Amino acid sequence: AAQTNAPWGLARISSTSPGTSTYYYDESAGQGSCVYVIDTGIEASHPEFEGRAQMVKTYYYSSRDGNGHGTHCAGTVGSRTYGVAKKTQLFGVKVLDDNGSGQYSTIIAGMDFVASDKNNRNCPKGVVASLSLGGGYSSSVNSAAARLQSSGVMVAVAAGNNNADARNYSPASEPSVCTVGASDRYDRRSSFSNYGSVLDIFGPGTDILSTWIGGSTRSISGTSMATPHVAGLAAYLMTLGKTTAASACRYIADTANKGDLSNIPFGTVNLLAYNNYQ
Ligand SMILES: [Ca+2]
């Protein structure tokens, strides 16, 4: 398949080079896979989801996304126009309030939920979790993200937007998950993007067009935008049978575009997510 005039991030992960506008992908598009979007929620009624999005859990008064962050990241995972895996199933786990903030205990509980809730869902091609959140270091949050990963869920987490080493941020510093940094449309590390030895992959994260609450769309920047790219790419690759949840992060690094990014500090991976579609 080919999407003409695609968001630059979608075209980027389907090309060996920057500057292209067409998103090439296999028509399977991640059908049969599930991606849990643990964030502010998902506006499931958004036409771009085509009924493939549902809210499964909320830790606040309402399951509605009053912020728009989670609907945006869920759109980057599997929206029709703005999604990597355009036929995946999207599950919304609202752990952040409508301010985009959330206590660590709630975030841990949200990850514990996805580890159990997945086994009462039909996801024959695997389960992915996209987590565009995080604060300072916390071994309890790292342990939770590791539990979700070990339960059989491909966990993609954001490296953080502090322009610092991700070693001091959770769940970014949990080694067993997929820590995702951000790159811009000219293959530079995003100005804000965290780095460090714990990063496993870089995704498009600067000015990412995706869906928004109110049936709308808008472009925002952050490692929060690069995470759903990798989460969608993993579900796309697991539907193709090229990898499993336990190995999708290692596979994406094995087949990533190597050495293309700039302002990557020494000791940080120069790998950009790539679907190798031909
Ligand atoms: Ca890792």
mmCIF file of C-alpha atoms and ligand atoms in Angstrom:
data_model
loop_
_atom_site.group_PDB
_atom_site.id
_atom_site.type_symbol
_atom_site.label_atom_id
_atom_site.label_comp_id
_atom_site.label_asym_id
_atom_site.label_seq_id
_atom_site.Cartn_x
_atom_site.Cartn_y
_atom_site.Cartn_z
ATOM 1 C CA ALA A 1 0.000 0.000 0.000
ATOM 2 C CA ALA A 2 0.967 3.647 -0.453
ATOM 3 C CA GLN A 3 -0.435 6.730 1.282
ATOM 4 C CA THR A 4 0.236 9.841 -0.781
ATOM 5 C CA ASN A 5 0.783 13.144 1.040
ATOM 6 C CA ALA A 6 1.278 11.311 4.326
ATOM 7 C CA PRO A 7 2.433 12.907 7.589
ATOM 8 C CA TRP A 8 6.202 13.289 7.388
ATOM 9 C CA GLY A 9 6.657 10.806 10.231
ATOM 10 C CA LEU A 10 4.729 8.083 8.419
ATOM 11 C CA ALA A 11 6.737 8.605 5.229
ATOM 12 C CA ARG A 12 9.944 8.667 7.289
ATOM 13 C CA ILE A 13 9.528 5.179 8.794
ATOM 14 C CA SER A 14 8.925 3.758 5.298
ATOM 15 C CA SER A 15 11.975 5.336 3.637
ATOM 16 C CA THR A 16 15.749 5.082 3.824
ATOM 17 C CA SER A 17 15.896 8.878 3.418
ATOM 18 C CA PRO A 18 14.180 11.976 4.820
ATOM 19 C CA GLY A 19 12.078 14.410 2.829
ATOM 20 C CA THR A 20 9.647 11.941 1.258
ATOM 21 C CA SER A 21 5.868 12.304 1.446
ATOM 22 C CA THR A 22 4.552 8.786 0.695
ATOM 23 C CA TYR A 23 3.949 6.230 3.454
ATOM 24 C CA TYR A 24 4.555 2.753 2.042
ATOM 25 C CA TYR A 25 3.250 -0.122 4.154
ATOM 26 C CA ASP A 26 1.904 -3.643 3.846
ATOM 27 C CA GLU A 27 -1.868 -3.720 3.396
ATOM 28 C CA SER A 28 -2.188 -5.975 6.458
ATOM 29 C CA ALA A 29 -1.698 -2.687 8.354
ATOM 30 C CA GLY A 30 -1.562 -4.415 11.732
ATOM 31 C CA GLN A 31 -4.954 -6.121 11.569
ATOM 32 C CA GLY A 32 -5.213 -8.746 14.291
ATOM 33 C CA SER A 33 -2.941 -6.828 16.680
ATOM 34 C CA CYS A 34 -3.955 -4.738 19.685
ATOM 35 C CA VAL A 35 -2.253 -1.592 20.976
ATOM 36 C CA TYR A 36 -3.076 -0.313 24.454
ATOM 37 C CA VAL A 37 -2.756 3.485 24.474
ATOM 38 C CA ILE A 38 -2.170 4.297 28.143
ATOM 39 C CA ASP A 39 -2.551 8.077 28.296
ATOM 40 C CA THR A 40 -5.341 10.643 28.710
ATOM 41 C CA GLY A 41 -7.795 8.316 26.943
ATOM 42 C CA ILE A 42 -9.024 8.049 23.367
ATOM 43 C CA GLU A 43 -11.920 9.829 21.664
ATOM 44 C CA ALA A 44 -13.201 6.564 20.224
ATOM 45 C CA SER A 45 -15.974 8.272 18.233
ATOM 46 C CA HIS A 46 -13.392 10.078 16.079
ATOM 47 C CA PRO A 47 -14.075 9.143 12.422
ATOM 48 C CA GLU A 48 -10.357 8.529 11.851
ATOM 49 C CA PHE A 49 -10.502 5.437 14.086
ATOM 50 C CA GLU A 50 -13.316 3.796 12.063
ATOM 51 C CA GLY A 51 -14.635 2.048 15.164
ATOM 52 C CA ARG A 52 -11.293 0.339 15.843
ATOM 53 C CA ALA A 53 -10.810 2.309 19.083
ATOM 54 C CA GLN A 54 -12.417 1.566 22.445
ATOM 55 C CA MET A 55 -11.994 2.776 26.007
ATOM 56 C CA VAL A 56 -11.349 -0.155 28.340
ATOM 57 C CA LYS A 57 -10.309 1.518 31.610
ATOM 58 C CA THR A 58 -10.305 4.900 33.314
ATOM 59 C CA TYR A 59 -8.875 5.967 36.669
ATOM 60 C CA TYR A 60 -10.869 9.218 36.842
ATOM 61 C CA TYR A 61 -14.498 10.338 36.781
ATOM 62 C CA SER A 62 -14.883 9.877 33.009
ATOM 63 C CA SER A 63 -13.405 7.703 30.276
ATOM 64 C CA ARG A 64 -13.529 10.682 27.897
ATOM 65 C CA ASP A 65 -10.273 12.255 26.717
ATOM 66 C CA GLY A 66 -10.601 15.852 27.878
ATOM 67 C CA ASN A 67 -6.978 16.685 27.033
ATOM 68 C CA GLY A 68 -6.424 15.363 23.501
ATOM 69 C CA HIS A 69 -2.955 13.925 24.115
ATOM 70 C CA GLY A 70 -4.073 10.296 24.186
ATOM 71 C CA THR A 71 -6.315 10.693 21.145
ATOM 72 C CA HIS A 72 -3.305 12.157 19.323
ATOM 73 C CA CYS A 73 -0.958 9.307 20.262
ATOM 74 C CA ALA A 74 -3.642 6.711 19.536
ATOM 75 C CA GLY A 75 -4.065 8.377 16.154
ATOM 76 C CA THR A 76 -0.358 8.017 15.437
ATOM 77 C CA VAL A 77 -0.620 4.316 16.335
ATOM 78 C CA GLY A 78 -3.590 3.414 14.175
ATOM 79 C CA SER A 79 -5.622 6.237 12.708
ATOM 80 C CA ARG A 80 -6.730 5.856 9.108
ATOM 81 C CA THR A 81 -4.841 8.946 7.911
ATOM 82 C CA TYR A 82 -2.268 9.457 10.680
ATOM 83 C CA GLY A 83 -1.583 5.908 11.925
ATOM 84 C CA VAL A 84 1.247 3.452 11.351
ATOM 85 C CA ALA A 85 -0.934 0.349 11.849
ATOM 86 C CA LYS A 86 -4.100 1.541 10.127
ATOM 87 C CA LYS A 87 -6.065 -1.658 10.867
ATOM 88 C CA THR A 88 -4.923 -2.374 14.428
ATOM 89 C CA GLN A 89 -7.314 -2.413 17.371
ATOM 90 C CA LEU A 90 -6.837 0.458 19.824
ATOM 91 C CA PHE A 91 -7.588 0.155 23.546
ATOM 92 C CA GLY A 92 -7.627 3.298 25.683
ATOM 93 C CA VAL A 93 -6.374 3.153 29.267
ATOM 94 C CA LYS A 94 -6.896 6.609 30.786
ATOM 95 C CA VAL A 95 -4.244 7.004 33.479
ATOM 96 C CA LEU A 96 -3.653 10.749 32.985
ATOM 97 C CA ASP A 97 -6.274 13.326 33.908
ATOM 98 C CA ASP A 98 -7.525 15.985 31.506
ATOM 99 C CA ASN A 99 -4.493 18.065 32.554
ATOM 100 C CA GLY A 100 -2.169 15.438 31.077
ATOM 101 C CA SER A 101 -0.846 14.608 34.556
ATOM 102 C CA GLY A 102 -1.115 11.461 36.636
ATOM 103 C CA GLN A 103 0.168 10.030 39.901
ATOM 104 C CA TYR A 104 2.653 7.167 39.702
ATOM 105 C CA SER A 105 0.387 4.746 41.583
ATOM 106 C CA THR A 106 -2.309 5.274 38.950
ATOM 107 C CA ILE A 107 0.188 4.745 36.118
ATOM 108 C CA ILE A 108 1.421 1.517 37.726
ATOM 109 C CA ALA A 109 -2.159 0.294 38.135
ATOM 110 C CA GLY A 110 -2.857 1.115 34.490
ATOM 111 C CA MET A 111 0.088 -1.025 33.411
ATOM 112 C CA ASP A 112 -1.000 -3.846 35.722
ATOM 113 C CA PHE A 113 -4.447 -3.666 34.107
ATOM 114 C CA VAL A 114 -3.171 -4.043 30.535
ATOM 115 C CA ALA A 115 -1.139 -7.089 31.568
ATOM 116 C CA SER A 116 -4.327 -8.823 32.751
ATOM 117 C CA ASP A 117 -6.974 -7.268 30.483
ATOM 118 C CA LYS A 118 -5.126 -8.476 27.370
ATOM 119 C CA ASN A 119 -6.053 -12.126 27.997
ATOM 120 C CA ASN A 120 -9.781 -11.363 27.697
ATOM 121 C CA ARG A 121 -9.240 -9.702 24.300
ATOM 122 C CA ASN A 122 -8.901 -11.239 20.842
ATOM 123 C CA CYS A 123 -5.430 -10.201 19.634
ATOM 124 C CA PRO A 124 -4.198 -13.201 17.624
ATOM 125 C CA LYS A 125 -1.154 -11.325 16.284
ATOM 126 C CA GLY A 126 0.101 -9.840 19.563
ATOM 127 C CA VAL A 127 -0.355 -7.009 22.039
ATOM 128 C CA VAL A 128 1.441 -3.651 22.156
ATOM 129 C CA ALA A 129 1.407 -0.914 24.790
ATOM 130 C CA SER A 130 2.217 2.701 23.908
ATOM 131 C CA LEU A 131 3.044 4.898 26.918
ATOM 132 C CA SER A 132 3.702 8.544 26.072
ATOM 133 C CA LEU A 133 4.207 9.674 29.659
ATOM 134 C CA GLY A 134 6.767 9.783 32.443
ATOM 135 C CA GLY A 135 8.437 11.792 35.185
ATOM 136 C CA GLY A 136 11.562 11.402 37.271
ATOM 137 C CA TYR A 137 13.129 8.056 38.132
ATOM 138 C CA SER A 138 11.033 5.551 40.077
ATOM 139 C CA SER A 139 11.890 1.879 40.539
ATOM 140 C CA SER A 140 8.197 1.125 41.123
ATOM 141 C CA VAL A 141 7.256 2.534 37.711
ATOM 142 C CA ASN A 142 10.198 0.767 36.059
ATOM 143 C CA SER A 143 9.163 -2.483 37.749
ATOM 144 C CA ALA A 144 5.610 -2.003 36.462
ATOM 145 C CA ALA A 145 6.713 -1.372 32.872
ATOM 146 C CA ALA A 146 8.945 -4.442 33.140
ATOM 147 C CA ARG A 147 5.989 -6.490 34.405
ATOM 148 C CA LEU A 148 3.866 -5.375 31.447
ATOM 149 C CA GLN A 149 6.718 -6.288 29.096
ATOM 150 C CA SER A 150 7.316 -9.686 30.708
ATOM 151 C CA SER A 151 3.582 -10.467 30.625
ATOM 152 C CA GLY A 152 3.870 -10.668 26.832
ATOM 153 C CA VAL A 153 3.154 -7.045 25.821
ATOM 154 C CA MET A 154 5.460 -5.035 23.578
ATOM 155 C CA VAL A 155 5.956 -1.948 25.754
ATOM 156 C CA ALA A 156 7.067 1.244 24.010
ATOM 157 C CA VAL A 157 7.789 4.170 26.332
ATOM 158 C CA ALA A 158 8.830 7.768 25.762
ATOM 159 C CA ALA A 159 12.397 8.794 26.547
ATOM 160 C CA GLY A 160 11.261 12.178 27.860
ATOM 161 C CA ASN A 161 11.401 15.800 26.765
ATOM 162 C CA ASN A 162 14.185 17.153 28.991
ATOM 163 C CA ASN A 163 17.166 17.162 26.565
ATOM 164 C CA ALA A 164 18.973 15.079 29.199
ATOM 165 C CA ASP A 165 19.975 11.477 29.802
ATOM 166 C CA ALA A 166 16.915 9.240 30.107
ATOM 167 C CA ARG A 167 18.625 7.351 32.962
ATOM 168 C CA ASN A 168 16.846 9.689 35.412
ATOM 169 C CA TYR A 169 13.312 9.196 34.068
ATOM 170 C CA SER A 170 10.690 6.459 34.383
ATOM 171 C CA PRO A 171 9.523 4.336 32.700
ATOM 172 C CA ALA A 172 12.171 5.515 30.226
ATOM 173 C CA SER A 173 15.036 4.071 32.292
ATOM 174 C CA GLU A 174 13.517 0.578 32.538
ATOM 175 C CA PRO A 175 15.884 -1.525 30.380
ATOM 176 C CA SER A 176 13.470 -4.321 29.432
ATOM 177 C CA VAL A 177 11.064 -2.050 27.500
ATOM 178 C CA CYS A 178 11.473 0.022 24.308
ATOM 179 C CA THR A 179 12.604 3.548 25.184
ATOM 180 C CA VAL A 180 11.860 5.867 22.258
ATOM 181 C CA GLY A 181 13.595 9.141 21.430
ATOM 182 C CA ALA A 182 12.345 11.847 19.086
ATOM 183 C CA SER A 183 13.686 13.043 15.730
ATOM 184 C CA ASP A 184 12.542 15.864 13.459
ATOM 185 C CA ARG A 185 11.774 15.889 9.737
ATOM 186 C CA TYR A 186 15.399 16.696 8.816
ATOM 187 C CA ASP A 187 16.807 13.658 10.681
ATOM 188 C CA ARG A 188 18.050 15.668 13.642
ATOM 189 C CA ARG A 189 17.456 14.544 17.192
ATOM 190 C CA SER A 190 14.533 16.594 18.451
ATOM 191 C CA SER A 191 15.757 19.608 20.419
ATOM 192 C CA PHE A 192 13.924 18.375 23.523
ATOM 193 C CA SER A 193 14.506 14.644 23.095
ATOM 194 C CA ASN A 194 16.189 12.712 25.871
ATOM 195 C CA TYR A 195 19.190 10.519 25.077
ATOM 196 C CA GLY A 196 21.396 7.998 26.865
ATOM 197 C CA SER A 197 22.433 4.372 26.718
ATOM 198 C CA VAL A 198 18.929 3.233 27.712
ATOM 199 C CA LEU A 199 17.348 4.445 24.460
ATOM 200 C CA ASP A 200 16.566 1.634 22.024
ATOM 201 C CA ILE A 201 15.172 3.490 18.990
ATOM 202 C CA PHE A 202 14.294 6.936 17.649
ATOM 203 C CA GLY A 203 10.969 7.891 16.127
ATOM 204 C CA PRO A 204 9.461 10.931 14.419
ATOM 205 C CA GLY A 205 8.538 13.301 17.210
ATOM 206 C CA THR A 206 8.637 16.945 16.077
ATOM 207 C CA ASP A 207 5.474 18.472 14.574
ATOM 208 C CA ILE A 208 3.534 15.214 14.288
ATOM 209 C CA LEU A 209 0.098 15.564 12.695
ATOM 210 C CA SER A 210 -2.507 13.274 14.249
ATOM 211 C CA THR A 211 -6.078 13.295 15.506
ATOM 212 C CA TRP A 212 -7.354 15.478 18.341
ATOM 213 C CA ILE A 213 -10.451 15.671 20.521
ATOM 214 C CA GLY A 214 -13.558 17.141 18.941
ATOM 215 C CA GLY A 215 -13.144 15.161 15.729
ATOM 216 C CA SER A 216 -10.182 17.443 15.059
ATOM 217 C CA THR A 217 -6.503 17.140 14.154
ATOM 218 C CA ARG A 218 -3.415 19.077 15.193
ATOM 219 C CA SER A 219 0.371 18.847 15.144
ATOM 220 C CA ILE A 220 2.350 18.644 18.394
ATOM 221 C CA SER A 221 5.912 17.689 19.298
ATOM 222 C CA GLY A 222 7.460 15.390 21.877
ATOM 223 C CA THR A 223 8.878 11.952 22.483
ATOM 224 C CA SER A 224 5.201 11.373 23.259
ATOM 225 C CA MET A 225 4.746 11.511 19.469
ATOM 226 C CA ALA A 226 7.664 9.214 18.620
ATOM 227 C CA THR A 227 6.452 6.453 20.953
ATOM 228 C CA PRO A 228 3.214 5.649 19.036
ATOM 229 C CA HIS A 229 5.224 5.448 15.808
ATOM 230 C CA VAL A 230 7.306 2.640 17.316
ATOM 231 C CA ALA A 231 4.254 1.096 18.982
ATOM 232 C CA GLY A 232 2.395 1.150 15.674
ATOM 233 C CA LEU A 233 5.436 -0.182 13.824
ATOM 234 C CA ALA A 234 5.744 -3.079 16.279
ATOM 235 C CA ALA A 235 2.082 -4.040 15.871
ATOM 236 C CA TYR A 236 2.564 -3.681 12.113
ATOM 237 C CA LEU A 237 5.550 -6.043 12.236
ATOM 238 C CA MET A 238 3.898 -8.531 14.606
ATOM 239 C CA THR A 239 0.879 -8.778 12.299
ATOM 240 C CA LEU A 240 3.342 -9.581 9.501
ATOM 241 C CA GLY A 241 4.738 -12.338 11.735
ATOM 242 C CA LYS A 242 8.241 -10.861 11.497
ATOM 243 C CA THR A 243 8.608 -10.597 15.293
ATOM 244 C CA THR A 244 6.967 -11.195 18.669
ATOM 245 C CA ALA A 245 6.154 -8.878 21.559
ATOM 246 C CA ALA A 246 9.210 -10.090 23.490
ATOM 247 C CA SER A 247 11.500 -9.276 20.539
ATOM 248 C CA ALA A 248 9.820 -6.436 18.616
ATOM 249 C CA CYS A 249 12.105 -3.800 20.148
ATOM 250 C CA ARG A 250 15.225 -5.792 19.247
ATOM 251 C CA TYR A 251 13.842 -6.425 15.758
ATOM 252 C CA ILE A 252 13.092 -2.736 15.175
ATOM 253 C CA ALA A 253 16.659 -1.880 16.199
ATOM 254 C CA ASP A 254 18.038 -4.666 13.986
ATOM 255 C CA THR A 255 16.193 -3.304 10.934
ATOM 256 C CA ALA A 256 16.275 0.422 11.738
ATOM 257 C CA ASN A 257 17.958 3.096 9.642
ATOM 258 C CA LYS A 258 21.440 3.370 11.149
ATOM 259 C CA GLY A 259 23.569 6.497 11.408
ATOM 260 C CA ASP A 260 21.088 8.882 9.779
ATOM 261 C CA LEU A 261 20.362 11.187 12.730
ATOM 262 C CA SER A 262 22.410 14.194 13.825
ATOM 263 C CA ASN A 263 23.216 15.593 17.273
ATOM 264 C CA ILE A 264 23.103 12.063 18.661
ATOM 265 C CA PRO A 265 25.484 12.154 21.655
ATOM 266 C CA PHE A 266 28.195 9.531 21.910
ATOM 267 C CA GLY A 267 26.827 6.485 23.696
ATOM 268 C CA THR A 268 23.320 6.973 22.270
ATOM 269 C CA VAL A 269 21.955 4.788 19.481
ATOM 270 C CA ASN A 270 21.718 6.349 16.018
ATOM 271 C CA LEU A 271 18.796 4.153 14.964
ATOM 272 C CA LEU A 272 15.612 5.430 13.306
ATOM 273 C CA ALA A 273 12.526 3.218 13.100
ATOM 274 C CA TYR A 274 11.988 1.742 9.642
ATOM 275 C CA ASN A 275 9.533 -0.853 8.332
ATOM 276 C CA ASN A 276 11.825 -2.039 5.486
ATOM 277 C CA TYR A 277 8.730 -2.374 3.301
ATOM 278 C CA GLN A 278 9.359 -3.240 -0.345
HETATM 279 CA CA CA B 1 15.429 -1.254 26.316
#
